[PDB]
Amino acid sequence: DDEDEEDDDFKE
Amino acid sequence: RKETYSSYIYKVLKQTHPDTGISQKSMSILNSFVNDIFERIATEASKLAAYNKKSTISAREIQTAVRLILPGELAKHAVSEGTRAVTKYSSSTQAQSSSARAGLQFPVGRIKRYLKRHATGRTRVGSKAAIYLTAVLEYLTAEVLELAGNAAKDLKVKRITPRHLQLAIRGDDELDSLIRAT
């Protein structure tokens, strides 16, 4: 999940 | 073009895992999936209509194509969703939107137009063909999202990342087969 740190939330 | 389905993917995620979010990278991957599967089904359905000299791509050609493309039981599950959608729309006394009439989040009218890009010459595309394809694309997206959301909950995280998508696809042998072919 450090993996995902630069992967922002999709915002509706 | 490759089209964007992210809004509609998110609507499906809200029905499947109301409490769970999804990362931008995950959404890009799902949008590629939808486009890829669309292209495979549409190409095959259009081929069926052409080889059989039909004037219209109909729900029969979509249904056949789904049975040729989706592996294992997944194909029969998906056929049932397409058939259900067509039935709901039909029994719809409606001045409602095509998608709403069929019970779908994915955009029927748009998908009908995209499908027309695969129809050569005089060949037409039926409304029920587009309902059925929409329903299959939505169902597949729901299957992946359900599984990936469960992987996320298993890892006590509150959104779907690409790793949960991998876990989902890798742990279902039919989806794994589908994605390896696509």
Author numbering:
A (entry chain C): 79 to 90
B (entry chain A): 1 to 182
Task: Quote the paper.
H2A.Z is an evolutionarily conserved histone variant of H2A and is essential for the viability of metazoans. Chz1 forms a trimeric complex with Z-B dimer and cooperates with SWR1 in histone exchange.
To reveal the structural basis for recognition of H2A.Z-H2B dimer by Chz1-FL, we reconstituted Chz1 complexes by mixing recombinant Chz1 containing residues 64–153 with yeast scZB at 1:1 molar ratio and determined the crystal structure of Chz1-MC in the complex of scZB at a 1.65-Å resolution. The binding of scZB and Chz1-C, which buries a total area of 494 Å2 (calculated by protein data bank in europe, proteins interfaces structures and assemblies [PDBePISA] program), is stabilized by both hydrophobic and polar interactions. The side chain of Chz1 residue F151 inserts into the shallow hydrophobic pocket surrounded by Y45, I57 in H2B α1 helix and M62 in H2B α2 helix. In addition, Chz1 residues E144, D145, D148, D149, and D150 form salt bridges and hydrogen bonds with R86 and R90 of H2A.Z as well as S58 and Q59 of H2B. Because equivalent arginine residues are also present in H2A (i.e., R79 and R83), this interaction is not sufficient to determine H2A.Z specificity (but see below). We refer to this common histone binding site as the DEF/Y motif hereafter, reflecting the consecutive D/E residues followed by a single aromatic residue.
